[PDB]
Structure 1
Amino acid sequence: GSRRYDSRTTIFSPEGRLYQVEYALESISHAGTAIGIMASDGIVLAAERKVTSTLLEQDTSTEKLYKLNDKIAVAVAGLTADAEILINTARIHAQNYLKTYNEDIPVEILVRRLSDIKQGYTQHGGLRPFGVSFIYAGYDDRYGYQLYTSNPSGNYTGWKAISVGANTSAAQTLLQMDYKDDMKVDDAIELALKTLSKTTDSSALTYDRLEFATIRKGANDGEVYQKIFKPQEIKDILVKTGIT
């Protein structure tokens, strides 16, 4: 019957690893690098678009950075189509929580929900996992500014600074070297771009090959603003930091 053709996506190896999760992580290691850096007065999200073209319409394009709600955003590394499925589910979950409790969803609760969905695909259903790793940048009134990551296994962890995708080993070493606890957003912006500039597989880092975003309390009085950077604004911050 049908058993003959079943790959069995939810089984352990003799060593106690999940085959499909490990292979999905291998897929993600070839994706464009995404970096998240948390500061005292905000969070930075930086990400590299993969080998683009001059004929790509950049100003209307979005492959890396997505908005989940007004307080939470994500950076994507892996299959974009897979990510959009999960992103829409996360957007709905945030709204369900808001309707139920009349309060914005705490960052961790949203992260846990998406991570549990990823987990399910590794334990039951016989389907392939989502080939996606997220960096979650968000704010709530309990823990303040928070950075998380999740991967196809459905395991998530909190971070001060983190990278996903390609060259994470090299990127994490550079972040671990120059990161300090009393750091500010403007400094974090510079660190993120400098790290990408060194780890990139491209010849030079330019505005058309980047997506950038910040989550600041730099909004008029006690509130939080999300800023998805425009192509011209990415070009300006590249000149300001002295990369181009």
Structure 2
Amino acid sequence: NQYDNDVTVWSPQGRIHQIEYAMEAVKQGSATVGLKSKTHAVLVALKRAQSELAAHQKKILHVDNHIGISIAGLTADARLLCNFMRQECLDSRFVFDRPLPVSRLVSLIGSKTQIPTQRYGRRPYGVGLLIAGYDDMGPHVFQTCPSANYFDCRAMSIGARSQSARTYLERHMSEFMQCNLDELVKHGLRALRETLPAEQDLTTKNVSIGIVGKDLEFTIYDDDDVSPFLDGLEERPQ
């Protein structure tokens, strides 16, 4: 109405309606699974295309050769936070020279995305980031929301009916740390299908793979360079 577009009107639960809308924006966006090991971090994201005479847009974006991000939601809102994450990580690398921990970086992002939620007349962003990083401790997958609230997970999946993906992840939680770079992707694939209908499984050109570590430099696999990482999947675990 106009009391739900005001960023200064709240529920009796003490929740601003504009923050609530902003979480859902993620959920209409495509499903992404982000997992960690003790040598690597893998970002598996689901693609989309406009036409058959087109290649799919990387949902894996290139920041640095040690940290990498994957988006789910609005691309334009994404790009402002992306310009912010690239600026901070590169800073860290020049000044400190430490291959930046994931854990410090997400908390500052949490501060910024919180500012429009407090501003009158300004909308929160509504993109979800699973930030994969590798520092000297080992890999971490942190998930930052359209609110401050950020998660340190072994594996996480966010998007449509994402709760179901977590269940597969929880059954193989320990395994992730032992498994290889190749397997971490295959366990990601098997989580990503749970979000989508059981009428459909993944295909080669809707999968984008983003691999992170400092035992390897950052790689984005697109639509046909996806295939080697892809093989080994189970059709709809229920």
TM-score, normalised on structure 1? 0.85
Secondary structure in structure 2 of the residue aligned to 1:208: coil
Residues 71-97 of structure 1, C-alpha deviations (whole Å, 9 max, x = no match): 111111111111111101111122233
1:176 corresponds, among 165, 170, 173, to 170
Q: Tell me how far 1:180 sits from its aligned partner.
A: 1.7
List runs of 5+ in structure 1 lacking aligned partners: 220-224
Preserved CA contact (<8 Å) 1:197 1:204:
yes
Letter in 2 for 1:67: H
1:152 corresponds, among 107, 122, 146, to 146
Distance in 2 between residues matched to 1:8 and 1:127, nearest whole Å = 9
> What percentage of aligned pairs have identical amino acids?
29
Name the structure 1 match of 2:192: 196
Q: Tell me how far 1:125 sits from its aligned partner.
A: 4.7
Name the structure 2 match of 1:230: 222
Pair 1:72–1:11, CA change in 2 (3 A) = farther
- Taking only aligned residues, the RMSD between alpha carbons, in angstroms, comes to 2.3
2:204 corresponds, among 201, 204, 207, to 207
**1:1-244 matches, cutoff 5 A:** 7-50=5-48, 53-58=51-56, 61-62=57-58, 64-141=59-136, 143-181=137-175, 182-184=177-179, 185-201=181-197, 203-219=200-216, 225-238=217-230, 240-242=231-233
Q: Tell me how far 1:162 sits from its aligned partner.
A: 0.2
Pair 1:39–1:102, CA change in 2 (3 A) = closer
TM-score, normalised on structure 2? 0.87
Preserved CA contact (<8 Å) 1:52 1:209:
no
Letter in 1 for 2:113: K
List runs of 5+ in structure 2 lacking aligned partners: none
Pair 1:241–1:151, CA change in 2 (3 A) = same
Secondary structure in structure 1 of the residue aligned to 2:65: coil
Aligned length in residues? 231
Q: Tell me how far 1:99 sits from its aligned partner.
A: 3.5
Runs of 4+ in 1 over 4 A off after TM superposition: none
Distance in 1 between residues matched to 2:218 and 2:135, nearest whole Å = 13
Pair 1:10–1:103, CA change in 2 (3 A) = farther
Distance in 2 between residues matched to 1:15 and 1:149, nearest whole Å = 25
Preserved CA contact (<8 Å) 1:47 1:212:
yes
When structure 1 is superposed on structure 2, of 32-41 and 98-107 the one drifting more is 98-107
Preserved CA contact (<8 Å) 2:139 2:213:
no
